[PDB]
């Protein structure tokens, strides 16, 4: 069998005990609420921070809600992290990933702006990308409402948010914002299509993210398999910014992350590839229920500090 950490295994056994309906069998509101509840019970509590403020910026469909996290009430110009939550582009919001954002802000000592991007099925592909790109460009412009000056931006996100991370970096690479992407951090991202991958078959059931959920999200979002904004493995990697790709060894979409990191090396780009051993997809948000995942997040943080100099 594949290696599973004991604390990870205990969580998986509890999920199996819970049982219950699939995402597709729930109403959309129920599916979203179930994600809120899982992260509410599984993640470590929020860090206390000097600044936690709701903002918004203009976007192509209307205003995009944002949340700013900063350990400092005032700070000098520097890079700003721009965070896109996971949830298949269907579930998640500013609260499902709130505690993680406070942790990133506390441990990095950099401001974090999370994006409340439009969700499918109500807003299919590419709505999420439109909002993540717009909000990242907005942050990169150092607007007065932000109260911080950005010298560069650092896209980061988990799962669908890691897909968005890569797409945003490619879009800004092609048409720069007011400051560059100085580092991108796609965490267990969807980069290439997982269909047909060995990891999707190996981890299709019993590893938190299921093949059934992947198919549910896909039906809702409707990304075009030939569009690099849906599957950014298809994009131009020759000028990719410095990158940290973090995956999980038990992740059905693990191989998608492997593929992306291999493509960056193939294009001669600087990349840190970290594959956390014995944990699942979503490890960034289960840091109380599976305490060893706090250390996995701390390794990403250390890699980010190193890559930033
Ligand atoms: C209850 C399942 C939680 C998985 C939600 C999540 O952690 O965010 C994801 C985002 C995107 C994809 N995907 O594109 O396959 C999978 C997961």
Automatic annotation (TrEMBL):
GO MF annotation: an example: hydrolase activity
Xref: Pfam families: Abhydrolase_3
Domain Alpha/beta hydrolase fold-3 intervals: 82-284
Keywords: Hydrolase
Name of this protein: Lipase
Lineage, highest ranks first: Bacteria, Pseudomonadati, Pseudomonadota, Alphaproteobacteria, Sphingomonadales
């Amino acid at each position: 069998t594949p290696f599973i950490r004991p604390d990870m295994k205990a969580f998986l056994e509890a999920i199996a005990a819970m049982a219950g309906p699939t995402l597709a069998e729930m109403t959309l509101e129920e599916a979203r609420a179930s994600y809120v509840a899982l992260h509410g019970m599984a993640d470590r509590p929020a860090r206390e921070l000097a600044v936690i403020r709701n903002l918004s910026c203009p976007g192509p469909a209307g205003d995009i809600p944002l949340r700013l996290y900063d350990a400092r009430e005032s700070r000098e110009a520097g890079p700003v992290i721009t965070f896109y939550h996971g949830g298949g582009f269907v579930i998640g919001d500013l609260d499902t990933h709130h505690n993680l954002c406070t942790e990133i802000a506390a441990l990095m000592d950099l401001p974090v702006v999370a994006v409340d991007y439009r969700l499918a099925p109500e807003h299919p592909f590419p709505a999420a990308i439109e909002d993540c790109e717009a909000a990242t460009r907005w942050v990169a412009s150092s607007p007065s409402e932000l109260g911080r000056t950005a010298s560069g931006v650092i896209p980061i996100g988990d799962s669908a948010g890691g897909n968005a991370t890569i797409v945003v970096s490619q879009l800004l690479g092609a048409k720069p914002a007011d400051v560059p992407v100085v580092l991108q951090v796609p965490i267990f991202p969807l980069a290439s299509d997982a269909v047909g991958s060995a990891s999707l078959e190996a981890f299709a059931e019993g590893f938190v993210l299921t093949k059934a959920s992947i198919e549910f999200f896909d039906t809702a979002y409707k990304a075009d398999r030939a569009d690099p904004r849906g599957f950014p493995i298809l994009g131009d990697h020759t000028a990719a910014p410095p990158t940290i790709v973090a995956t999980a060894s038990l992740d059905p979409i693990r191989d998608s992350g492997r593929d992306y990191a291999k493509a960056l090396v193939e294009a001669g780009r600087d990349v840190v590839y970290l594959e956390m051993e014995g944990v699942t997809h979503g490890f960034t948000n289960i840091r109380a229920a599976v305490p060893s995942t706090q250390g996995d997040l701390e390794r990403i943080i250390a890699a980010m500090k190193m890559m930033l100099g």
